[PDB]
């Protein structure tokens, strides 16, 4: 039995006397190992819960639990997708089992000083291939987020995107120094100025021969806070503030494999936010690409300032025309207080786009909830000096940040904003298919959203 | 012209040369006073904004601005509801103008050491009467919330409800001492024990001859925090922690005027949360009316503990049977971080009830957003000692508190939870129809919700 | 011997885990009395006026703020076969008193009687082992609570030896 075989069991399914004696009750993610019938290999009995309540997430989580229980085995065959009786069709089971296996195997050992084959048993080969690709993209995002900021600097991150673009056949332009200055991304330049690592701006285009979607990803490779320095003695995953950029890049790398008939452009501002003799100051004013002005009332609300000019560039009327814009950003720390650590916030004025993103997230097994663009919170954007502030010092910053970003989206362009600060990094232990640390959150939601949009 | 007449003006409507010279541009809530044509009285020109974008809230706010600009006049006639051209029908205009006038006139002068008539001009007399009644109920809630806690103690609040019930014809039972102990409301008793003011429990029933709806209102008349004492030097409106109870009581007082064909029971636990030699302790366990247990990990999360047993009582299978339960509570301080100071949180697993409450709030002009009952946040209810904790000390307490309350709602009973901590008290200056301090938030949403449910 | 040592440890675990509202100083004194009776240990519980006579003014002053009055318990293992004294701190709930522990910091305030728990449990194991030595347990039990009548910063306690 190829070293280890993992069998999915719904509640009520038969297992041997040994599994029963060990307490196997088919609880989701429960794994009991036993010798195979011939005594030459290992069987894992893996719980899928009641058949009537099982979802694709159940299969995804059960696959992750299987690969975690593999021990020193060289080969693992997952039969989980062959369990029927639930409402989850075979193709969705196969896709989810494939995702969960890759996501569950993920390790980040690059900075530390025998499993050779995972096989998914199913006729749904296409679904398996899609699952593997989606999960591999997620793991790419995980690597990028986990990467120490001293390795993944803005220049190094730009180089990495260039290499990934080259592999995938994606068109890539990297802007730096004077070339960057010409673009008028004054938020990026101002925020990035304090650091010894100069900022970068990268555009990625997936453009198959077969609507144009713009993806904007916040790539603050290290967020210290700037002069409004993050308190020492509080823990912050400061290197993880490029999770939005990671999600966008990774999603873009998966599109050529899927062959989606839609044009997608990625827009990635990359910078460090550092305290320094030449750092952006509280009370300074940024004049943005659209001529409007932002007073910097708190240097740690840097992401919205960096994204502003990119949203103008991405959405402005011009050559070939981006029909809709989605931004992804580890933007706000206020959200998590209400929503908790595992749910992202979705903002959009477009109800059908909201539905498209939420349904995409459900298929992907990623938790989002929509928050309203409350008109009465615009009063908290007011500045005594400029057109707006980047920080009100009042409650409601998650909503205020969304309204701030909305100011820079050209009139009539459908737009959605994904604030993923909390779910982008897991500071608790591993659970299900999610490791400690960088999660790659939103990659799969984005892929699913782009699929629906292409249909 | 009866001292003062207020005329509604949409953008583009004609005003005299004087109003133009003063800068009147029909901006919503803008008021420019001028002599009447005959020179004997005062005309207020009041902005209603563009006709195409005006809503009922525009009329409500314009009416509030009118009554604020009345000066020393003895009589005020509002003609605002006679302005047509907008999408707001005459009856809705009249209702809103009536509400706004009363809400805008509200003052709380009881503890400080000429306007004799406001008239709303319209044929829609019924709509005016409904608006006045809804606004008067709101103002009752405002008074209750503004009341110093040393005056509105739990015993005094129970007496006040008894008096209000008697006026309205509502059946009222007040429980205290041993009689209270018999009900098994052990959360209420435990939380209330530290104070010198003993707790109370009050049930109110509107039962016209013409479904049974249960309303549960958190009535913590003073929330100091208990032994987990609220930090001195932070400002908290500790007397306002009975805003939920206020909203429920006030809504119940309005029902006999409206003559709604539905039975509605109010359930009001009333207590002070005080530090004391005999106060509830961190690590103590409450055994609730359903036999389940709650570990007190933070004494300042007292409201959910108080509400728990009342929700069991309100929803248990028994005589005549409460078909649905809505609780209203100034429950959580985490919500406001995400949602801001003017929006309540709505929780329910029932999508149609969610729609009913949200649409009711829209008609009432009160801001709510629905938050999800996230299954993955139940893990944060776990206790090493009891069935659950009242505080996880983690992010997501607004959602966790809702899930906590959900545990006590009997199976199959539709339920909604309204968390209104922030919008129940305005700690900024007055705006539109909203004063500084107690707002009476949720009263009108509740009335509108009960109307829809009765239809 | 292993089972007995571990069972004593588990008794201490129960006492520490017990919610302070159940394991009050009076209730803890009752529990020790019951455990002493089982084991054959001599037990004296002091309370109210009887407690006042002993001159344990630290205990009385610290315990005064709480609605749960303090207790003092002596336990003696005295087999027929040196005299060792064991003194165990039994603050059944430590809120901090008027110097109130900051809310928003986590403290296992009910666990402040762990010393008393360890001493009581150790004493319960001695009759099983049959050790040839006399051992007395001395257990002051109180809550430290904020209150209108709680011990104040700047107050002076005059102790049983006359020092302050
Ligand atoms: Mn920041
Ligand atoms: Mn940032
Ligand atoms: Mn509280
Ligand atoms: Mn409270």
The token pair at A97 is 């089992």
At A86, is the secondary structure helix, strand, or coil?
coil
Contacts of A278 (CB under 8 A, 6+ apart): A193, A194
Gap between the Cα atoms of B439 and B423, Å rounded: 7
Gap between the Cα atoms of C134 and C123, Å rounded: 10
Residues in chain B: 455
Chain B's closest residue to C149, CA to CA, is: B277
**B134 CA: distance to closest CA in chain C (Å):** 40
**C127 CA: distance to closest CA in chain B (Å):** 31
**Taking Cα atoms as reference points, which of B338, B291, C5 lies closest to residue A343?**
B338
Question: A80 near A63, Cβ under 8 Å?
Answer: yes
Gap between the Cα atoms of B240 and A308, Å rounded: 40
Evaluated on CA atoms A268, A269, A272, A274, the torsion sign reads negative
Q: How far is the CA of B334 from the centre of ligand 3 (A)?
A: 12
The token pair at C45 is 């519980």
Q: What are phi and psi of A346, to 5 degrees?
A: -115, 130
At B384, is the secondary structure helix, strand, or coil?
coil
The burial of B399, by beta-carbon neighbours within 10 Å (0-12 exposed, 13-18 middle, 19 or more buried), is given as buried
For β-strands C90-94 and C134-144, DSSP reports them as: parallel
Computed on alpha carbons and rounded to an integer, the radius of gyration of chain A in Å comes to: 23
Question: Which residue carries 């009973």 as its tokens?
Answer: B413
Buried b (16+ CB within 10 A) or exposed e, B22-60: eebebebbbbbbbeeeeeebbbbbbbbbebeebbbbbbb
Gap between the Cα atoms of B426 and B112, Å rounded: 20
Q: Is B123 left (phi over 0), alpha (psi -120 to 50) or beta?
A: alpha
For β-strands B200-206 and B388-389, DSSP reports them as: unpaired
Q: Is B230 a catalytic residue?
A: yes
At B282, is the secondary structure helix, strand, or coil?
coil
Gap between the Cα atoms of A274 and A286, Å rounded: 17
Evaluated on CA atoms B290, B291, B297, B302, the torsion sign reads positive
Gap between the Cα atoms of C126 and C73, Å rounded: 18
**Taking Cα atoms as reference points, which of A52, A57, A39 lies closest to residue A10?**
A52
Alpha helices in chain C (DSSP H): 2-17, 25-39, 48-53, 57-63, 114-129
Question: Which residue carries 């209104």 as its tokens?
Answer: B420
Query: How far is residue A308 from each of residues A242, A291, A390, B167, C20, measured CA to CA in Å?
Result: 16, 11, 11, 58, 55
Q: What are phi and psi of A159, to 5 degrees?
A: -60, -40
Q: What are phi and psi of B299, to 5 degrees?
A: -70, -15
Gap between the Cα atoms of A303 and A212, Å rounded: 25
Gap between the Cα atoms of B188 and B202, Å rounded: 12
| Count of B-C CB contacts under 8 Å | 67
**Taking Cα atoms as reference points, which of A61, A169, A179 lies closest to residue A432?**
A61
At C57, is the secondary structure helix, strand, or coil?
helix
A414 CB neighbour count, 10 Å cutoff: 16
Gap between the Cα atoms of A245 and A222, Å rounded: 12
At B438, is the secondary structure helix, strand, or coil?
strand
What resolution does the deposited structure have, in angstroms? 2.3
Q: Is A120 left (phi over 0), alpha (psi -120 to 50) or beta?
A: beta
3-state secondary structure A370-407: ECCCCHHHHHHHCCCCCCEECCCCCCCHHHHHHHHHHC
The token pair at B184 is 């098994």
Q: What are phi and psi of C11, to 5 degrees?
A: -60, -45
Q: How far is the CA of B401 from the centre of ligand 4 (A)?
A: 12
Gap between the Cα atoms of B374 and B361, Å rounded: 23
The burial of A359, by beta-carbon neighbours within 10 Å (0-12 exposed, 13-18 middle, 19 or more buried), is given as middle
Beta bridge partners of B285: B295
**Taking Cα atoms as reference points, which of B102, B242, B222, B224 lies closest to residue B161?**
B242
Q: Is B193 a catalytic residue?
A: no
Interchain proximity A380–B339, CB inside 8 Å: no
The burial of B232, by beta-carbon neighbours within 10 Å (0-12 exposed, 13-18 middle, 19 or more buried), is given as exposed
Helix (H) or strand (E) holding A360: helix A351-364
Q: Which of B22, B27, B68, B230 is catalytic?
A: B230
For β-strands B425-426 and B415-419, DSSP reports them as: unpaired
DSSP A239: G
Question: Which residue carries 């029963």 as its tokens?
Answer: A20
Helix (H) or strand (E) holding C80: none
For β-strands C42-46 and C90-94, DSSP reports them as: unpaired
DSSP B249: H
B397 is in an annotated binding site: no
Gap between the Cα atoms of B280 and C24, Å rounded: 13
| Range A123-455: architecture per CATH | 3-Layer(aba) Sandwich (3.40)
Question: A333 near A238, Cβ under 8 Å?
Answer: no
Question: B216 near B306, Cβ under 8 Å?
Answer: no
Gap between the Cα atoms of A452 and A446, Å rounded: 10
Gap between the Cα atoms of A10 and A282, Å rounded: 58
Q: Does B430 touch chain A (CB under 8 A)?
A: no
For β-strands C71-77 and C134-144, DSSP reports them as: antiparallel
Q: Which of B60, B142, B304, B363 is catalytic?
A: B304
Gap between the Cα atoms of A204 and A265, Å rounded: 5
B218 is in an annotated binding site: yes
- Chains touching B (3+ CB pairs < 8 Å): A, C
DSSP state letters, A212-232: EEEEEE-EEEEE--TTSPPPT
At A6, is the secondary structure helix, strand, or coil?
strand
Question: A386 near A294, Cβ under 8 Å?
Answer: yes
Gap between the Cα atoms of B256 and B252, Å rounded: 8
Helix (H) or strand (E) holding B358: helix B351-364
Ligand nearest to the CA of A230: 1
Helix (H) or strand (E) holding A303: helix A303-315
**Taking Cα atoms as reference points, which of B36, B33, B55, B37 lies closest to residue B46?**
B33
Gap between the Cα atoms of B347 and B409, Å rounded: 13
Q: Does A377 touch chain B (CB under 8 A)?
A: yes
Interchain proximity B341–A395, CB inside 8 Å: yes
Gap between the Cα atoms of A150 and A182, Å rounded: 27
Question: C40 near C130, Cβ under 8 Å?
Answer: no
Alpha helices in A80-153 (DSSP H): 90-105, 125-146
Interchain proximity B276–C21, CB inside 8 Å: no
Angle at alpha carbon of residue A220, lines to A277 and A325, rounded to 5°: 135
**Taking Cα atoms as reference points, which of B24, B10, B7 lies closest to residue B85?**
B10
Q: How far is the CA of B193 from the centre of ligand 4 (A)?
A: 15
For β-strands B367-370 and B285-287, DSSP reports them as: unpaired
**Taking Cα atoms as reference points, which of A341, A188, A326, C32 lies closest to residue B395?**
A341
Computed on alpha carbons and rounded to an integer, the radius of gyration of chain B in Å comes to: 23
Beta bridge partners of B216: B267, B327
The token pair at A280 is 């952006």
For β-strands A200-206 and A263-273, DSSP reports them as: antiparallel
Buried b (16+ CB within 10 A) or exposed e, A184-209: bbbbbbbbbbbbebbbbbbbbbbeee
DSSP state letters, B50-113: -TTT--HHHHHHHHHHHHHT-TT-SEEEE-GGG--SSSS-HHHHHHHHHHHHHHHH----TT--
DSSP state letters, A263-301: EEEEEEEEEEE---TT---TT-EEE-TTS-EEE-S-TT-
Write down the domain spans for chain A. 1-122, 123-455
Buried b (16+ CB within 10 A) or exposed e, A113-139: eeeeebebbbebeebbbbbbbbbbbbb
C164 CB neighbour count, 10 Å cutoff: 7
DSSP state letters, C8-43: HHHHHHHHHHS-TTTS-HHHHHHHHHHHHHHHT-EE
Q: At what angle do helices A243-258 and A125-146 cross, to 10 degrees?
A: 150
Gap between the Cα atoms of A299 and A283, Å rounded: 9
The burial of B184, by beta-carbon neighbours within 10 Å (0-12 exposed, 13-18 middle, 19 or more buried), is given as middle
Question: B141 near B451, Cβ under 8 Å?
Answer: no
Gap between the Cα atoms of B59 and B47, Å rounded: 9
The token pair at A435 is 């490791």
Interchain proximity B367–A374, CB inside 8 Å: yes
Question: B10 near B28, Cβ under 8 Å?
Answer: no
Query: How far is residue B363 from each of residues A145, B56, B246, measured CA to CA in Å?
Result: 46, 8, 20
Question: What technique solved it?
Answer: X-ray
């Amino acid at each position: 039995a190829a070293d280890v075989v993992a069998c999915g069991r719904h509640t009520g399914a038969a297992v041997g006397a040994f599994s029963r004696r060990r307490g196997f009750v088919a609880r989701p993610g429960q794994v009991v190992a036993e010798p195979s019938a011939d005594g030459r290999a290992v069987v894992l009995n893996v719980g899928l819960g009641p058949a009537g309540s099982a979802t694709a997430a159940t299969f995804r989580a059960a696959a992750a639990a299987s690969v975690r229980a593999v021990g020193p085995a060289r080969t693992l065959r997952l039969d989980l997708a062959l369990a029927d009786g639930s409402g989850v069709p075979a193709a969705e089971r196969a896709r989810a089992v494939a995702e969960g296996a890759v996501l569950g195997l993920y390790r980040y050992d690059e900075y530390r000083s025998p499993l050779a084959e995972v096989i998914v048993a199913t006729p749904e080969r296409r679904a398996v291939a899609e699952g593997l690709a989606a999960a591999e993209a997620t793991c790419l995002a995980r690597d990028l987020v986990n990467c120490p900021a001293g390795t993944l600097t803005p220049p190094a991150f730009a180089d990495r995107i260039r290499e990934l673009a080259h592999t995938a056949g994606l068109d890539c332009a990297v802007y730096e120094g004077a070339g960057l200055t010409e673009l008028g991304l004054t938020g990026l330049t101002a925020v990035g100025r304090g650091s010894a690592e100069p900022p970068r701006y990268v555009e990625l285009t997936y453009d198959p021969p077969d609507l144009t979607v713009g993806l904007v990803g916040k790539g603050v490779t290290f967020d210290s806070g700037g002069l409004s320095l993050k308190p020492s003695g509080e823990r912050h995953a400061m290197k993880a503030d490029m999770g939005g950029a990671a999600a966008v890049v990774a999603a873009l790398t998966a599109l050529p494999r899927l062959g989606l008939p839609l044009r997608v452009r990625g827009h990635l501002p990359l910078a460090e936010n550092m305290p320094d003799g030449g750092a952006l100051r509280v009370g300074d004013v940024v004049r943005h690409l659209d001529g409007t002005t932002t007073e910097i009332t708190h240097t740690d609300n840097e992401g919205r300032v960096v994204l502003a000019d990119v949203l103008v560039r991405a959405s402005r009327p011009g050559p070939h025309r981006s029909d809709l814009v989605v931004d992804v950003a580890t933007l706000t720390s206020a959200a998590v207080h209400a929503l908790g650590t595992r749910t992202g916030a979705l903002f959009t004025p477009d109800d059908r786009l909201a539905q498209t993103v939420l349904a995409a997230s459900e298929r992907a097994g990623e938790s989002f909830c929509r928050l309203p663009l409350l008109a009465h919170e615009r009063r908290n954007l007011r500045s005594a000096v400029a057109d707006r502030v980047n920080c009100s010092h009042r409650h409601g910053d998650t909503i205020q940040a969304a309204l701030f970003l909305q100011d820079f989206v050209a009139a009539g362009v459908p737009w959605a904003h994904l604030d993923i600060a909390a779910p982008a990094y897991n500071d608790e232990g591993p659970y299900a298919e999610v490791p400690y640390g960088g999660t790659g959150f939103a990659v799969r939601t984005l892929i699913e959203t782009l699929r629906a949009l292409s249909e």
